[PDB]
Amino acid sequence: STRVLKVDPLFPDEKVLKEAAELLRNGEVIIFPTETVYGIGADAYNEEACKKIFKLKERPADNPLIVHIHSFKQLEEIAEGYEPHLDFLKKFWPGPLTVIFRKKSEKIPPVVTADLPTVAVRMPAHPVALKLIELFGHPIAAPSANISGRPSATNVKHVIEDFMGKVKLIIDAGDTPFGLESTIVDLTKEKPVLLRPGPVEVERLKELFPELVVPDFVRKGHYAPLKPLILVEDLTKMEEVLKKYPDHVVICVEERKELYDDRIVVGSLKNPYSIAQNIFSALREAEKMGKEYIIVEGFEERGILFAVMNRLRKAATEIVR
């Protein structure tokens, strides 16, 4: 019997958080907001509880979980070799950044890290997440709140779609600020490696780390709707595509809304953060509009839209370059 408890994002009712903390202590899984996407979390030191996350998501065991912390002191408990990067961390944490370090803790079971000698760590800039972790007293292991393969939940409506009846508690703090998962940066190798683009933008990381490596899998290509998805990087072929795929809905920017008939406006190029904020909602709307094909306009591989494109490329059933 899933309880959905609404809380203020800045000053959440600590009584709701306590209820959540209790469930975590009982080895239950709960869903909570962050500034990026909703997470589905368990006690990070509880092997059995973390196993439930995999079951509930229908997730491969080889796909490791991000461990969420509230203090730099917790970092010492779980990781080693981070001391040269403390200046960096203190500049972006709390915030939408996940970093890979060598695993110290034997407190974090292998299921969490998929037997890897590394651990992904994030200190989320969302008062609800921070206050929950602190009150609970252990780190929380949490992937995104969605059935594996599907778009990451950015609001409680999407969470309910995927998890009503399957978890005891969803904390609702409204639509997540960014709409997109944290930037993941691997700091275990000699040169830092970008594993996932996010709200900490590539251009910013390149300023800080001139030798940042951006693997091919980041630039090429999860987050997938139920209907086939057609991504159109070259918008001159838009007309060809529309006519090739007749029974369709289009996801488009505002400045090209008038150029279609059946269209979801995801946001404006004027304010690209609007596009990031709404893109996953758009895919969930689209898949329900009773059309055979979802057709999405492409975006610049720059700033936050880089992250958007990363997500769409990984979701698309066909790309049109």
Q: Which residues sit in the known binding site for ATP?
A: 59, 63, 118, 144, 152, 196, 223
What is the closest distance, in whole angstroms, from the C-beta atom of residue 224 to Mg ion in the complex?
11
What is the closest distance, in whole angstroms, from the C-beta atom of residue 148 to ligand TXA in the complex?
8
Name the burial class of residue 77, with classes exposed (0-12), middle (13-18) and buried (19+) by CB atoms within 10 angstroms of its CB: middle
What is the closest distance, in whole angstroms, from the C-beta atom of residue 184 to Mg ion in the complex?
11
- Alpha carbon 136 to chain centroid, angstroms: 22
How many C-alpha atoms does 197 have within 13 Å on its Cβ side?
A: 29
First-residue to last-residue Cα distance in the chain: 47
- The Cα angle at residue 274 between residues 271 and 278, in degrees rounded to 5: 160
Identify what 26 binds: ligand TXA, Mg ion, none; CB under 5 to 8 Å per kind: none
Name the burial class of residue 31, with classes exposed (0-12), middle (13-18) and buried (19+) by CB atoms within 10 angstroms of its CB: buried
Identify what 182 binds: ligand TXA, Mg ion, none; CB under 5 to 8 Å per kind: ligand TXA
The stretch near Mg ion (CB under 5 A) out of 20-28, 125-133, 138-146, 273-281 is 138-146
Distance CA 132, CA 118 (A): 25
What is the closest distance, in whole angstroms, from the C-beta atom of residue 36 to ligand TXA in the complex?
3
Q: Which amino acid belongs to residue 13?
A: D
> Which of 88/176 has CB closer to Mg ion?
176
What is the closest distance, in whole angstroms, from the C-beta atom of residue 287 to ligand TXA in the complex?
19
The footprint of ligand TXA (CB under 6 A) covers 34, 36-37, 39, 63-66, 98, 100, 113, 116, 118-120, 122, 124, 142-144, 181-182, 184, 195
> Which of 112/295 has CB closer to ligand TXA?
112
The stretch near Mg ion (CB under 5 A) out of 16-24, 91-99, 144-152, 158-166 is 144-152
Looking at 36, 105, 144, 278, which residue binds Mg ion (CB under 5 A)? 144
According to the 3-state scheme, what is the secondary structure of 49-97?
HHHHHHHHHCCCCCCCCEEECCCHHHHHHHEECCHHHHHHHHHHCCCCE
> Which of 116/135 has CB closer to ligand TXA?
116
Distance CA 276, CA 307 (A): 8
